Symmetry: C3
Subunit: 161 residues, 3 copies
Amino acid sequence: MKTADLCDQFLDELQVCELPFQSYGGKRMFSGPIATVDVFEDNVLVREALETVPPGTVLVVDGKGSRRVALLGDRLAQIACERGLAGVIIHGCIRDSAEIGAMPIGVMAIGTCPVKSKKEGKGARDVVLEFGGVRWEPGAYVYADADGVVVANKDLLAKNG
Amino acid sequence: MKTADLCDQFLDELQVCELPFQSYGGKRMFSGPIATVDVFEDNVLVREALETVPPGTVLVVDGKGSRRVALLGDRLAQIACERGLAGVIIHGCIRDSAEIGAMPIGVMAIGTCPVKSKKEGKGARDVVLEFGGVRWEPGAYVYADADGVVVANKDLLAKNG
Amino acid sequence: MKTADLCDQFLDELQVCELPFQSYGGKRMFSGPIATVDVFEDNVLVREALETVPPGTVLVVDGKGSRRVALLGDRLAQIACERGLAGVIIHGCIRDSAEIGAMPIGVMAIGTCPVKSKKEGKGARDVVLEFGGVRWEPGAYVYADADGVVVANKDLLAKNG
């Protein structure tokens, strides 16, 4: 589960995120199949994804790194906990960081912003994301911890060759 | 008291600081009427302000974001505690961060620096400050927490319209 | 031992590091005689240094600030603990930060990276390093804590004039 160990064993099959994230959730280490959301200062699709993706999923949200609004708050983090998701990785900001820090889920983002995001529904789910020098594909697997975030095109702990 | 809630209710009457601060005090959430100090690597006026502003005040210090010296240390933070101030927000650095982290007051700054600031008394108090994309006016109200810092031109929790 | 106090008393004999470090070890405050290592994404010499420098030493490693690989992990940090070193300061990244945070040693670096460094042995030990606006010389003394890092050309707490 350590990204350090995964790199030592499978570096050739891994993409290493170049963007350093701040860890906000109660869980510092988390991993699972990737579900994607591509938005810009709007989180309606982030919410719909959290309410529908399979348990154990790690939702990756490309918010273009905007710091003008938060894309996830305690209400949405709560949904993630209630539906048994592994965590959320956001190329953007979150809010209610105090409350999220007390939840048993992983949450990584580049910063905090108290302003709510737009609620128009613009953006798309299940598309290929591109940020942090990494190509995030639906169905791929992401592993995150205190040292970083790495992505594999399949479950590296269920393979045999 | 949450900046997230204040933005949802009063965004149109609020200024949202664009500069992310590091939180150093024992209190992560604090708010109150603003008192201003405008200086450059000198903290004599910061000290005089802390020794004279009314209880509950949040001292906002524009140190131009300099990282060459600290503008507040444990002695001054102690004064802030003894006189019942709400906290201090500094566009600059502080020192004695270890000691300040144990004090029941809010302290936000952009970094730490072990070097003491000049003691010449240059600068001015009670002037309008301009940094972080925000206009900080004396008498205005500031609310700070783990998600950010927002400024209103009056007490938003004592108003009725 | 506080960098703030050292600056107040000996600023004229001190070099103040301009590069802000993240603190990863169980010890937030540490100091001692400097041992140097100059490398670039390779840590064989970092390991050899940790296995040979005198107890109480603070190993300073100039990794050119690279964020592509880690230069120190839990194995090497463990060696530092077993041989009684004071700490390590790295102009580069580390990994196994979770594990290192539980160790009684000082560790400062600019970030984390899960990828292992090269093991070719390129680089040099006991040379003068130059980074963070500071000239790091073998035999010099370094003092580090929550506020910063300062370097003196001799033990400032064993001198008399």
